[PDB]
Amino acid sequence: XXNXX
Amino acid sequence: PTRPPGMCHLDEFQCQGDGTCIPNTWECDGHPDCIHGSDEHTGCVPKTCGHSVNTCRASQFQCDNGRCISGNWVCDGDNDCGDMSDEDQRHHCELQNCSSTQFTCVNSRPPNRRCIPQYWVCDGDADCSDALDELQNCTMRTCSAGEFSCANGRCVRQSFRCDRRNDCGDYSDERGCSYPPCHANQFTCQNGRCIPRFFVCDEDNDCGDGSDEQEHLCHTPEPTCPLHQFRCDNGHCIEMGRVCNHVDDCSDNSDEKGCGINECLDSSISRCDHNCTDTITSFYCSCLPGYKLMSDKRSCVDIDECKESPQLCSQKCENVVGSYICKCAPGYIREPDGKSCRQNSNIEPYLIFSNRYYIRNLTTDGSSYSLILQGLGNVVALDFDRVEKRLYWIDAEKQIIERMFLNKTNRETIINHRLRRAESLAVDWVSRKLYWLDAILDCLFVSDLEGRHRKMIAQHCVDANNTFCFEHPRGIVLHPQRGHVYWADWGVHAYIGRIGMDGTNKSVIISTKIEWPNAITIDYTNDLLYWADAHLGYIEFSDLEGHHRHTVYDGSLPHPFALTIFEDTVFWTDWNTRTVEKGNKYDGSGRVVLVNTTHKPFDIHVYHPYRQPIMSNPCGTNNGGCSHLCLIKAGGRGFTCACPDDFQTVQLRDRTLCMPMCSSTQFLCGNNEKCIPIWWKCDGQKDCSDGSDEPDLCPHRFCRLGQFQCRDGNCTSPQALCNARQDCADGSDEDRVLCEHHRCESNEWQCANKRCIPQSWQCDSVNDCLDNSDEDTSHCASRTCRPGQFKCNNGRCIPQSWKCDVDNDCGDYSDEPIDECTTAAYNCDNHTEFSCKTNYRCIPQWAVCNGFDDCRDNSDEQGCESVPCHPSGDFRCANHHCIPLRWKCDGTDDCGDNSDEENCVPRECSESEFRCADQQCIPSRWVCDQENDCGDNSDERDCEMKTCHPEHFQCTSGHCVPKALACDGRADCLDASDESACPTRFPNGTYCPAAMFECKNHVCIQSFWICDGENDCVDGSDEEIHLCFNIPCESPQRFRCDNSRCVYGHQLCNGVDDCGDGSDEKEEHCRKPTHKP
Amino acid sequence: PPLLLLPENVRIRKYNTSSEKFSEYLEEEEHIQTIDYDWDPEHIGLSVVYYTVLAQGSQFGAIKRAYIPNFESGSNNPIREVDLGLKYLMQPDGLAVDWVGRHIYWSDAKSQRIEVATLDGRYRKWLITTQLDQPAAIAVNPKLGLMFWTDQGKQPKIESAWMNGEHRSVLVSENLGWPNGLSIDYLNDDRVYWSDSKEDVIEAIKYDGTDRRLIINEAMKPFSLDIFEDKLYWVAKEKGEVWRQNKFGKENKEKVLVVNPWLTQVRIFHQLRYNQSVSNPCKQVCSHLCLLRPGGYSCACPQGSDFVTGSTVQCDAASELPVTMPPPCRCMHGGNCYFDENELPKCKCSSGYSGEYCEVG
Ligand SMILES: *[C@@H]1O[C@H](CO)[C@@H](O[C@@H]2O[C@H](CO)[C@@H](O[C@@H]3O[C@H](CO[C@H]4O[C@H](CO)[C@@H](O)[C@H](O)[C@@H]4O)[C@@H](O)[C@H](O[C@H]4O[C@H](CO)[C@@H](O)[C@H](O)[C@@H]4O)[C@@H]3O)[C@H](O)[C@H]2NC(C)=O)[C@H](O)[C@H]1NC(C)=O
Ligand SMILES: *[C@@H]1O[C@H](CO)[C@@H](O[C@@H]2O[C@H](CO)[C@@H](O[C@@H]3O[C@H](CO[C@H]4O[C@H](CO)[C@@H](O)[C@H](O)[C@@H]4O)[C@@H](O)[C@H](O[C@H]4O[C@H](CO)[C@@H](O)[C@H](O)[C@@H]4O)[C@@H]3O)[C@H](O)[C@H]2NC(C)=O)[C@H](O)[C@H]1NC(C)=O
Ligand SMILES: *[C@@H]1O[C@H](CO)[C@@H](O[C@@H]2O[C@H](CO)[C@@H](O[C@@H]3O[C@H](CO[C@H]4O[C@H](CO)[C@@H](O)[C@H](O)[C@@H]4O)[C@@H](O)[C@H](O[C@H]4O[C@H](CO)[C@@H](O)[C@H](O)[C@@H]4O)[C@@H]3O)[C@H](O)[C@H]2NC(C)=O)[C@H](O)[C@H]1NC(C)=O
Ligand SMILES: *[C@@H]1O[C@H](CO)[C@@H](O[C@@H]2O[C@H](CO)[C@@H](O[C@@H]3O[C@H](CO)[C@@H](O)[C@H](O)[C@@H]3O)[C@H](O)[C@H]2NC(C)=O)[C@H](O)[C@H]1NC(C)=O
Ligand SMILES: *[C@@H]1O[C@H](CO)[C@@H](O[C@@H]2O[C@H](CO)[C@@H](O[C@@H]3O[C@H](CO)[C@@H](O)[C@H](O)[C@@H]3O)[C@H](O)[C@H]2NC(C)=O)[C@H](O)[C@H]1NC(C)=O
Ligand SMILES: *[C@@H]1O[C@H](CO)[C@@H](O[C@@H]2O[C@H](CO)[C@@H](O)[C@H](O)[C@H]2NC(C)=O)[C@H](O)[C@H]1NC(C)=O
């Protein structure tokens, strides 16, 4: 999403 | 011995005024020894030397509202008294068992009566809540094609669908509908129900979920009666032009109920603990500073200013009755202002933080900015060790954990196996252990600093309630002083968890007003837990028990990921702005952006001796007596022996025994020190410390590192072992003795044939084990969903977040019971969730305005121009969507209209990147590596003069390959130069065993590759016709050409001459032999 | 009369300025950029032209050489090309050939360098490789021992230096747009000329860089220049036309040809353009390369190699043998060419003509 590295 | 930097000896007291040390016998001796009398603190005690409306009759039931009704209808399932007084368990309805032969439809619930008369049983009307009275003893219905046929068996017309009413019993009518929104005057509830506006705020839960009774829209703030309004005791306030005017303005002269005003002139009456003050009709009490008016309005209590307001002291705080005093932790001196503490040791701090490709060493003011290491894959985690001056990190690209000294020497890799997704790590400087979270195995690990003795200490879920579980672990901090491990979770049920360092006492710390807790850390001076949220954009801190939360930044942060505190300053890393920046740790004042990082700065730490405070090791010497891990017990005082993961802990009479439980597919070392995979045995590299992994009778290794070698010179990946497929040509991968105890990783489930598949795949209506074991009906009926997961009637398992989300997930609709899916227990959280207008599901706030229909009815995407993007780290696209600023000009369309990439200037590459012809950046590792990466092949341009990195073997053609790929029996350069100069690998002159064909240039291949059209080895001796004349050039598999060379398989008549005389592209062999015999 | 040479993206066309008609030349090629020629080095009657190729996709560019007839006309001759083996070329926007010393000069716009090698392109070496944004076409003046180059990046400049890479200097840097082509008037005191695709002018200046003059204005986006006799040649890139004007800029803009926009350069093929009478100053003492300089010469080593310690002539690197050249079809006066089993270019004379290559008859 928007947090996964 | 030493005096530790800035600190004092163990038996010495530190003068908080200036940091000088005095003997312990001098403190609390009755004489001020320090410059500011810190040795004579208050904490040391001195020396010791018509009757009624509801009277009714004996045959009539009595009602609260004043009605009288016949006693026959009491507790019949419906209100007869007119006020429910005959329909409650408050007086009596618990035993409302009805009359005689009535059918008891137990599916009915208090909104309806379970007992139904047989007068209308099977009458065609849905008497029961799911109409079971129409099937239990009833003649079948033929139904009609013009009517809606319920899948359960009932028959109704199409007027009974999409109306919030269970006409079919099985909700088949209401299931799958797409209810249009409510009307103009109609009110809408959270669960999508439509109710008349008049029915708001009437003490009846008409919305079902209580939407129409919400406090915000129902409570009427009483007229405040502000300045120029005298609030009289009656509540009908007037103007103060009328105070004590002797005219009754407020009912019984409440405005003149008292005009003496000075009611404080007494002791027993008005009793105020401290001071009193009069008012226009009466008195009120007040307290001295540092005291709180409690709920009785008639006393004063001392507040704990250290717990209520920690920002009043820079460090450890001490409460006093009526006030507080700010102390400083050891190693800090108290400033003359009386509040700020200042670090004493001359070792000044600096910030160690990690980037993509980089680890950087930054001074705390932004003046100095250096490079520790470069060329790493992706450093997402990092930590240091004060005792050995070491440094640890996680390279997520390679899935390994490295370590090196702080002076760039002795780079080593401690853990390199079974690392699937490690998101964070922390170093335990006390008991010399290493901790790291796994986001794929969903667990917590502990290990020795050198890498041996890995063990699990947390898994599954935390609370006894199985609501918060290990969905997405991220961020970890240790508090070894009290033996606790704090980690943050950013799953759908996000929280912050705590567990003892030996796995005892796992509990939940913080689980409210939190969505994306990326960062976490503890301040070791005042003992305050710190964390930040990536979605809500705050920085919050609280006591170690999760109490007395306070907010530093309130919604002003784009995206924190890591943070650390030293002294009074907090440093955090922002993804969206790609910056490292700092501010005050209590209120956020003094915000300064320290550095423009091109890549995302992931993890940050402050390297200073005080950030890892010293104290005595519970496992002091002899490793606590345990042959294995000596862990700190919960509370920090005791210790607990424990065995590694692949061991069985068995308790003797008074001490612990560890038994090896190495599985059949694994090799146990000779000293029983550890259990390693069987393909690590005889691989040529010594893994066991005793060398037992490499016996004397080792067969020749045909296969690479990390590859399983079959019993006869054939290779396969380790995943092939016991997967119920014949992978080895010999079949040794499916051997019985090898597989008979093939216990595999925890997060997957094992089938009957001992092949194992991911745990969720069982009972998903797909035969995955190839023996139908995972689809066995009895097993699915009898199994259990893992903790934190709901169990379907189908036997499938789904995450708890899929329950009551409208969309079916269990095949059968037990995961969406609308009777339960609309109650008040499933209201959305008003902070982090957005309620759909029509459907009853709740979706996270960040899913709103993303270009995707998460609510299934475009509620989240409608009216997107009303959403204002974040002011600091967001960019607004043409279609008015908000995207992180880090995705602008990144190279990909990220909002569906190319707006993020319109008018884009190329960026300048960093210190470890090479710039292609078209000005894009690729790592320096990709230059001269025998593959195209710049599109225009620019990475391989002019690869003769450039060196290769010290671990790379340069090919004579100028390209580079890792030095481990030389002298191995196969060509890794594109001209076999890696093997060309290699020495003879056998005393008898050859280069590889007798089971392999050997080409001219010392590279060699398998037998079956000879004469296949594939130039297996360069300068190929495989395509030598003279030696290949006698190989089996057989018609069923090889086309024997006229020139006596044979052609492998499908290459015949393929369109290109693979033979060399033109008859490969010819007739009479690839044409019809006898016209399809 | 001089013969014009015009390279298109796929083919090379030569046009006689007096006969006013085209003739057949090299075909079946792709992404060629610029050409230059050497006048019959072996004095048999065939000159050598050098043309580069740009690259697309995975494959890289290269430099190739081919033969051209020096007589009136030649057709049906199977012209064969040969690659110099110069690997790793991105965009050779500029190429020049030095007839004194058998050296070839070219610059890579993407690599931001200027290379040097022998006519067969073996002894590769970087001459200047620092402070270039987008190096444009180049020019060489062996008589004065000075080479010229320009830049068209963020800082448009025109520079000159010795042929061995030292004594680099900038001619002008003011009132410059997008330089595209360079030319030197070998007879008018070695005056130099250059174009501009933004200012749309052609200017001239002396070799040292004094008395800058605006010769002609509003040239409709010129690309390349060539000076012969007393006239100047340029090509409008966006339209493909060729024009003439007095080299002193006091005459009307005459029209010559209209060609497709694939036209890349205009080059005059004549011996008097280069004055082959210049002698070689080299003493044949150098080991690998003998570069030129004003009043003398110098020795050089291949790229990534240095001289033996103590010495300044002998290089440490080995020396590879030269590359042989295929024979051309010398068939003259409307003859035809044919290849036998030996693959020698055995000509087929026309009616009334005799001899080996059918010279006269
Ligand atoms: C980069 O920085 C690292 C770490 O700071 C340096 O590595 C250290 O190098 C020093 C030597 O310069 C090492 O010191 C030697 O360690 C030996 C082993 O000590 C271990 O065990 C003891 C006891 O349990 C622990 O206290 C200690 O922490 C270690 O775990 C000692 O036995 C050696 O002592 C011997 O020699 C000395 C004289 O030098 C005698 O006085 C003694 O009697 C004895 O004969 C010695 O002290 C040190 O171990 C290394 N670091 C660590 C902690 O491992 C790098 O050298 C440095 N690199 C550069 C290039 O600067
Ligand atoms: C990976 O696994 C494959 C499995 O096929 C191995 O391939 C086999 O390799 C061996 C040689 O190491 C071959 O053995 C030869 O078999 C010939 C007859 O083949 C029949 O019998 C074998 C089993 O023995 C069957 O597999 C096959 O289908 C046939 O039914 C013999 O005639 C050969 O002996 C002759 O040559 C030898 C020297 O090689 C002489 O010493 C003898 O006197 C005699 O003249 C030989 O025994 C076997 O056939 C191969 N299998 C197949 C089907 O091709 C690979 O070896 C292994 N990986 C690697 C690269 O080692
Ligand atoms: C130069 O030297 C190398 C050795 O350094 C020679 O290569 C050897 O060649 C022989 C004969 O082909 C090989 O012997 C055969 O090996 C087969 C499989 O390997 C066995 O041995 C290894 C250990 O090397 C074990 O780890 C493995 O598990 C296997 O057990 C066997 O199947 C063959 O068995 C047959 O003969 C034996 C007696 O030798 C009988 O007991 C059996 O019943 C059966 O009939 C055989 O043992 C040997 O493995 C090769 N060694 C290596 C390492 O290459 C080269 O041949 C020589 N140069 C040349 C080209 O001639
Ligand atoms: C609010 O509360 C405090 C405490 O009730 C009141 O303080 C009172 O202050 C006066 C002046 O400081 C004190 O009187 C003085 O006492 C000393 C002896 O301690 C004496 O030597 C002086 O001559 C003088 O009398 C008084 O003791 C103190 N109250 C008590 C009971 O201790 C204050 O007046 C209150 N103020 C308000 C806003 O109501
Ligand atoms: C990150 O950057 C900082 C500052 O650039 C580095 O701090 C410096 O570390 C070196 C090595 O310890 C110190 O050098 C030593 O100084 C003493 C005198 O103080 C001298 O006697 C020694 O011979 C040696 O030269 C330097 O003083 C120190 N500076 C400060 C202000 O701390 C830090 O090491 C860097 N971190 C890493 C891991 O690169
Ligand atoms: C764990 O779940 C249980 C069951 O839902 C919770 O206990 C009930 O919570 C509801 C909330 O409305 C109350 O109505 C019930 O009275 C509670 N008690 C029981 C035994 O049913 C429990 O609160 C949850 N765990 C925690 C710690 O909150």
Ligand SMILES: *[C@@H]1O[C@H](CO)[C@@H](O[C@@H]2O[C@H](CO)[C@@H](O)[C@H](O)[C@H]2NC(C)=O)[C@H](O)[C@H]1NC(C)=O
């Ligand atoms: C084990 O866990 C429990 C719960 O986390 C701890 O109990 C808390 O202890 C503190 C004092 O240290 C109390 O103030 C809290 O009210 C307690 N909370 C609850 C709900 O029990 C307990 O201290 C832990 N003990 C150890 C040894 O770790």
Ligand SMILES: *[C@@H]1O[C@H](CO)[C@@H](O)[C@H](O)[C@H]1NC(C)=O
């Ligand atoms: C960081 O970026 C801004 C522009 O985005 C730039 O002006 C600033 O100089 C950079 N940081 C600092 C403080 O130098």
Ligand SMILES: *[C@@H]1O[C@H](CO)[C@@H](O)[C@H](O)[C@H]1NC(C)=O
């Ligand atoms: C809405 O969020 C606030 C945040 O303080 C919370 O206090 C309040 O209880 C929430 N409303 C409801 C109905 O829960």
Ligand SMILES: *[C@H]1O[C@H](CO)[C@H](O)[C@H](O)[C@H]1NC(C)=O
């Ligand atoms: C110490 O002396 C004080 C004097 O005020 C008290 O009497 C106190 O109770 C004494 N403590 C003990 C233990 O006797």
Ligand SMILES: *[C@H]1O[C@H](CO)[C@H](O)[C@H](O)[C@H]1NC(C)=O
């Ligand atoms: C199912 O639940 C049982 C207890 O009812 C066990 O905990 C078992 O381990 C569970 N299975 C899975 C897959 O977690």
Ligand SMILES: *[C@H]1O[C@H](CO)[C@H](O)[C@H](O)[C@H]1NC(C)=O
């Ligand atoms: C290979 O042959 C050389 C001689 O050519 C040496 O004998 C060498 O020792 C041989 N290789 C091995 C491993 O013994």
Ligand SMILES: [Ca+2]
């Ligand atoms: Ca004292």
Ligand SMILES: [Ca+2]
């Ligand atoms: Ca009733």
Ligand SMILES: [Ca+2]
């Ligand atoms: Ca009925």
Ligand SMILES: [Ca+2]
């Ligand atoms: Ca319905």
Ligand SMILES: [Ca+2]
């Ligand atoms: Ca209501």
Ligand SMILES: [Ca+2]
């Ligand atoms: Ca009044």
Ligand SMILES: [Ca+2]
């Ligand atoms: Ca207090």
Ligand SMILES: [Ca+2]
């Ligand atoms: Ca997970």
Ligand SMILES: [Ca+2]
């Ligand atoms: Ca959430």
Ligand SMILES: [Ca+2]
């Ligand atoms: Ca955010």
